[PDB]
Design a protein around this ligand. Structure first.
Ligand SMILES: *[C@@H]1O[C@H](CO)[C@@H](O)[C@H](O)[C@H]1NC(C)=O
Ligand SMILES: *[C@@H]1O[C@H](CO)[C@@H](O)[C@H](O)[C@H]1NC(C)=O
Ligand SMILES: *[C@@H]1O[C@H](CO)[C@@H](O)[C@H](O)[C@H]1NC(C)=O
Ligand SMILES: *[C@@H]1O[C@H](CO)[C@@H](O)[C@H](O)[C@H]1NC(C)=O
Ligand SMILES: *[C@@H]1O[C@H](CO)[C@@H](O)[C@H](O)[C@H]1NC(C)=O
Ligand SMILES: *[C@@H]1O[C@H](CO)[C@@H](O)[C@H](O)[C@H]1NC(C)=O
Ligand SMILES: *[C@@H]1O[C@H](CO)[C@@H](O)[C@H](O)[C@H]1NC(C)=O
Ligand SMILES: *[C@@H]1O[C@H](CO)[C@@H](O)[C@H](O)[C@H]1NC(C)=O
Ligand SMILES: *[C@@H]1O[C@H](CO)[C@@H](O)[C@H](O)[C@H]1NC(C)=O
Ligand SMILES: *[C@@H]1O[C@H](CO)[C@@H](O)[C@H](O)[C@H]1NC(C)=O
Lengths: 451, 415, 197, 49
């Protein structure tokens, strides 16, 4: 295997590289939040309305009470996970009817009221891409009664004592929470997460976001149309990438498929004999006398109890992993969406600007908007400048040279400026700084005093 | 359920409901034939040990009390079936094998057993149903000169499969030298007689065996017990007895496309889905009766003794063994109101319940996410705060739990 | 409000109560009391009943150990979170949103508790807002003036520069503004004078 | 200093050691060797063991 391309970056003790243009990048992070809530009855699974099996099962103590308690704790924890991730907003904000935010096109993530479930375009794409197993949370006993074509797998899972409980928050309510978070992010900024919502124009909010990452705010105002076009093209690229390839949502599909195959294994384990003569209790009860049928029923009880314990233990470990992922998704909602994050590679690759939540089946999708420098240029640099026997250091910037003249510029963008006492400060002599150069420093007070 | 006398506010799962069966239909094939048990059970003699007899019984009504009437046998000693449960079980085919045995042969002929008789004369399969009836027939097989008409086989080149018969009077050679009509030069006759004597020892007394081995197959069942047939019922939770396949369900008319040689439908969990009728050629589909969990919605007993009941996952037009239909089942005892508050008792897909003044009652509602807000956005308007508040909140986090230590010998055994 | 530590107490009490209660079951034997099996039967049949009791008690003890291991993993995750919150909220100031309380974080004080810790997060919350008119830059003598730190506001007639989180208006001066470019690029630039000291 | 990676090695060693040593137990039967049970007994009792 290849680890990647080979790079030999050119390092010298007086050479620096400073970017001159940027790109706006929108990425996508998919995180699971909750999983399927299930409830299992012991007496229908192990015995199934057999009185003799129930009488023999009563001697095994309190295995079934603690299995029921474990599954109930998992089912409550799933609703706690969804409530912790999504319900981070106090009021349901809504977008003003004018859709002008400085040239940024938010039509693909803001909802439309045409369809009943008020979901956006990208949320509809995410909901259509994750194919559901159509489990027992939908009422289906009316469909289980009506025998059309063949017997369904979900009806067979239902008939053996396994029940799927619906979540507390419907998908429309998750979509309303996502719309409230989007309207608060677009209109207010980070101010809606620290108290009341405080309105601000979107251009001034984005200028604040650029000031967060060490770039001055005139870079936005002098390049507003370019940044707006780059954001619109990035959003369109995310839409086309979702509509083309369907392998990016593998985590939520894995969440669906693991529960489907776990319930399938638990149903298929009822066919086993476990050393008895038949896997059906009615045949043992009709064929044998009291004592030998008690022996065979006890063997079947031991096997089915062991399979149920295995299922509950796997469910507990999966729920712990899902809870850790839901805690991570809640932290990412609190930090990326409700503010601006300074942590590297948290909230996207690059210098983070802002993030947008989108609801997905059994999870959440974050669209991280970041800042990536694009076109660099080699320069000659110096740590300080000697002038009148005094060493001058930049206030916030870096000294560069084009070959003849010396300039001071900001670190993340190329904006050269004439070296002046306003943008530099004096500290010490010229004999202590290694690499100091000789140049002049402008003083604006002398032409003002002369004129 | 909670093993207490005071409960708190919340929703508790108490038990599970089930629609009980009403009738009991027994579907059964109509046959007037009587099985030949009496006709070929009583005989003055049986066949040889090495050459027994097979009797095929099929397509008749079977009676199983004749063993007490005819033979004075000691015990049934049967594997896989009860002697008194044969009256209800309907089988595929009855096989009758009658042959005499020696005294040290009742325990020798068994599934998963070897010896000398089981190699050549009579071999039972390891997994089979039906059994061996044996008794004492010492005086029934005692001529004054003794019995030598029964023959015994002890030599073979290889082993012999279960349920097989050997009829040969050849010569086996224990070497490379053939004999071809001479016995004694390193070759002996595999056929041997029996030393049955009236003055013989007790350990090798002449006995007798009649085998009644049955079989369990998915073949069309011909021989059954004596039962009665009952007419069809539809769309009702009823116990059924289709050819001995018992259970409980709702017998809906099938939509399927069963081929003429296929009778039983099969489930993924090894149960049955559709069963061919034993009186006609109509396939009928089985669906189990309605069931689900039941949850009791209460406030604390310090507040009130009023409760509500949630039957989970049922379209409760068939509730029994205010009514509001919910996504998560249906709610009895709570009145649906067109308001929106916070969630107190979480029920289902967006529905909550609470104890409200507006005489007290238990109400049910869809919950509210929050107050509707619409902040005034403009492209030249800002809002800047002029004062502030200092707030102290509280965050609680567990750190450690209890440390325990268990030894096996005190817990499991106890000195 | 302290239901987490109470649940930590309750689960550990309930698991031991269930483990004690599981000694009363027969598990298919004839008695749940071992001395009665010793005193009533011979060697072989008492060995059979003892083996049934051994299998049941071993199974219950293994289920208890597995549940305790999963609970200990959850408790260790919570303890790691509490240690991180102690190092960041109490030993310093945190810039993370909704970490160390809701609002702009200032202080935090630890308090001990049974099987846990309690944090008192002191935060800053803005209270009384007021509408204003704002501009991104000021056009003066063909030069665009952007604020160094803060934001331009207007009460209807005059223009001021103020900090973001508090209304403290000031006269627009070249000390608190910087110059970049001309007035023909910025969208929304207004006309106002900038004082020269 | 490196106790954590040493514990990662040691736990994976001792779990497999316990899994190997568990094959010596009789678990209530008469022999822990499967060939001895197959050779000494009949079909049904060897099936039980
Ligand atoms: C700086 O780099 C040059 C060229 O690589 C080298 O000759 C010089 O020794 C370096 N400076 C120091 C102090 O080593
Ligand atoms: C971009 O915005 C315009 C209106 O400003 C709208 O008509 C168009 O549909 C938007 N683009 C997309 C891809 O929706
Ligand atoms: C800078 O100089 C190095 C070394 O001469 C060269 O490899 C590189 O291409 C130059 N340009 C940039 C943009 O790094
Ligand atoms: C810089 O200037 C000072 C005095 O003007 C001189 O002594 C020194 O040698 C100069 N340094 C270089 C590198 O030319
Ligand atoms: C059994 O019943 C069917 C129809 O009910 C009839 O055609 C058939 O002749 C009957 N068989 C006997 C042996 O009476
Ligand atoms: C068997 O048949 C013979 C002759 O029909 C009869 O003498 C004998 O008593 C019968 N045996 C029994 C047990 O009825
Ligand atoms: C099942 O429930 C739905 C929900 O109210 C109802 O519309 C439908 O009629 C029910 N089906 C029946 C009663 O067969
Ligand atoms: C700013 O808003 C006003 C009214 O809300 C509108 O007339 C004006 O066209 C907007 N500015 C731009 C550049 O669209
Ligand atoms: C600001 O203006 C909006 C609409 O004109 C109004 O609803 C609001 O009360 C005003 N004041 C504040 C403090 O937002
Ligand atoms: C601002 O002043 C310039 C000249 O100083 C003028 O051309 C421009 O129209 C003015 N803008 C407004 C909005 O009055």
């Amino acid at each position: 295997m290849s680890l990647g391309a080979e790079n030999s970056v050119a390092y010298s003790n007086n050479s620096i590289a400073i970017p001159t243009n940027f790109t706006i990048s929108v990425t996508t992070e998919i995180l699971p939040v909750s999983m399927t809530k299930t409830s299992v009855d012991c007496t229908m699974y192990i015995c199934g309305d057999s009185t003799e099996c129930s009488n023999l099962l009563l001697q095994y103590g309190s295995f079934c009470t603690q299995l029921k308690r474990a599954l109930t704790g998992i089912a409550v924890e799933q609703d706690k996970n969804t409530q912790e991730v999504f319900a981070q907003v106090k009021q349901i904000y809504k977008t003003p009817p004018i859709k002008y935010f400085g040239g940024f096109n938010f039509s693909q993530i803001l909802p439309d009221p045409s369809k009943p479930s008020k979901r956006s375009f990208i949320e509809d794409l995410l909901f259509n891409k994750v194919t559901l197993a159509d489990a027992g949370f939908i009422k289906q006993y009316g469909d289980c009664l009506g025998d059309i074509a063949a017997r369904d797998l979900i009806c067979a899972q239902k008939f053996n004592g396994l029940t799927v409980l619906p979540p507390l928050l419907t998908d429309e309510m998750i979509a309303q929470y996502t719309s409230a978070l989007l309207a608060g992010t677009i209109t207010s900024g980070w101010t809606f997460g620290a108290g009341a919502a405080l309105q601000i124009p979107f251009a001034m909010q984005m200028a604040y976001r650029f000031n967060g990452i060490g770039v001055t705010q005139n870079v936005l105002y002098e390049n507003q149309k370019l940044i707006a076009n780059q954001f619109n093209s990035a959003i369109g690229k995310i839409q086309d990438s979702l509509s083309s390839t369907a392998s990016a949502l593998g985590k939520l599909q894995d969440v669906v498929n693991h529960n489907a195959q776990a319930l399938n294994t638990l149903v298929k384990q009822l066919s086993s004999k476990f050393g008895a003569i038949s896997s059906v209790l009615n045949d043992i009860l009709s064929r044998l006398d009291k004592v030998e049928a008690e022996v065979q029923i006890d063997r079947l009880i031991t096997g089915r109890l062991q399979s149920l314990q295995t299922y509950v233990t796997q469910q507990l470990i999966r729920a712990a992993e899902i809870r850790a992922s839901a805690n991570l998704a809640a932290t990412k909602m609190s930090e990326c969406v409700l503010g601006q994050s300074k942590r590297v590679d948290f909230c996207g690759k690059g210098y983070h600007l802002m993030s947008f939540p989108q609801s997905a089946p059994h999870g959440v999708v974050f669209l991280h908007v970041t800042y990536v420098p694009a076109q660099e240029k080699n320069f000659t640099t110096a740590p300080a400048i000697c002038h009148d026997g005094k060493a001058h250091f930049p206030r916030e910037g870096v000294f560069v040279s084009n070959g003849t003249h010396w300039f001071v510029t900001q670190r993340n963008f190329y904006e050269p400026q004439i070296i002046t006492t306003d943008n530099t400060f004096v500290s010490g002599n010229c004999d202590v700084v290694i690499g100091i150069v000789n140049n002049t420093v402008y003083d604006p007070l002398q032409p003002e005093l002369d004129s | 359920t909670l093993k207490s006398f005071t409960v708190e506010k919340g929703i508790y799962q108490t038990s599970n409901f089930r629609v009980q069966p009403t009738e009991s239909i027994v579907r059964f094939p109509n046959i007037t034939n009587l099985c030949p048990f009496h006709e070929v059970f009583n005989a003055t003699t049986f066949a040889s040990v090495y050459a027994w007899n097979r009797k095929r019984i099929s397509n008749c009504v079977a009676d199983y009390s004749v063993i007490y009437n005819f033979a004075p046998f000691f015990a049934f000693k049967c594997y896989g079936v009860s002697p008194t449960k044969l009256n209800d079980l309907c089988f595929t085919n009855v096989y009758a094998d009658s042959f005499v045995i020696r005294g040290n042969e009742v325990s020798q002929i068994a599934p998963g057993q070897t010896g000398n008789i089981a190699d050549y004369n009579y071999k039972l399969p390891d997994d089979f149903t039906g059994c061996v009836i044996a008794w004492n027939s010492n005086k029934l097989d005692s001529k004054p000169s003794g019995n030598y008409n029964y023959l015994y086989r002890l030599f073979r080149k290889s082993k012999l499969k279960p349920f097989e018969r050997d009829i040969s009077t050849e010569i086996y050679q224990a070497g490379n030298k053939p004999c071809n009509g001479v016995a004694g030069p390193n070759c002996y006759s595999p056929l041997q007689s029996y030393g049955f004597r009236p003055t013989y020892g007790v350990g090798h007394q002449p006995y007798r065996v009649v085998v009644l081995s049955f079989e369990l197959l998915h073949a069309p069942a011909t021989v059954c017990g004596p039962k009665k047939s009952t007419n069809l019922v539809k769309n009702k939770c009823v116990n059924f007895n289709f050819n001995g396949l018992t259970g409980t369900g709702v017998l809906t008319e099938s939509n399927k496309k069963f081929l003429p040689f296929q009778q039983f439908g099969r489930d993924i969990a090894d149960t049955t889905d559709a069963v061919r009728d034993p009186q006609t050629l109509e396939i009928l589909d089985i669906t189990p009766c309605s069931f689900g969990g039941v949850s009791v919605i209460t406030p604390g007993t310090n507040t009130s003794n009023q409760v509500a009941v949630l039957y989970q996952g049922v379209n409760c037009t068939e509730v029994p063994v205010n009514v509001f239909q919910t996504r998560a089942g249906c709610l009895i005892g709570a009145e649906y109101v067109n308001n929106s508050y916070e969630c107190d008792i979480p029920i289902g897909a967006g529905i909550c319940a609470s104890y409200q003044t507006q005489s007290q009652s238990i109400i049910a509602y869809t919950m509210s996410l929050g107050a509707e807000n619409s902040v005034a956005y403009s492209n030249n308007s800002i809002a800047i705060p002029t004062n502030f508040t200092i707030s102290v909140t509280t965050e609680i986090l567990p750190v450690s739990m209890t440390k325990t230590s268990v030894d096996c010998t005190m817990y499991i055994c106890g000195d």
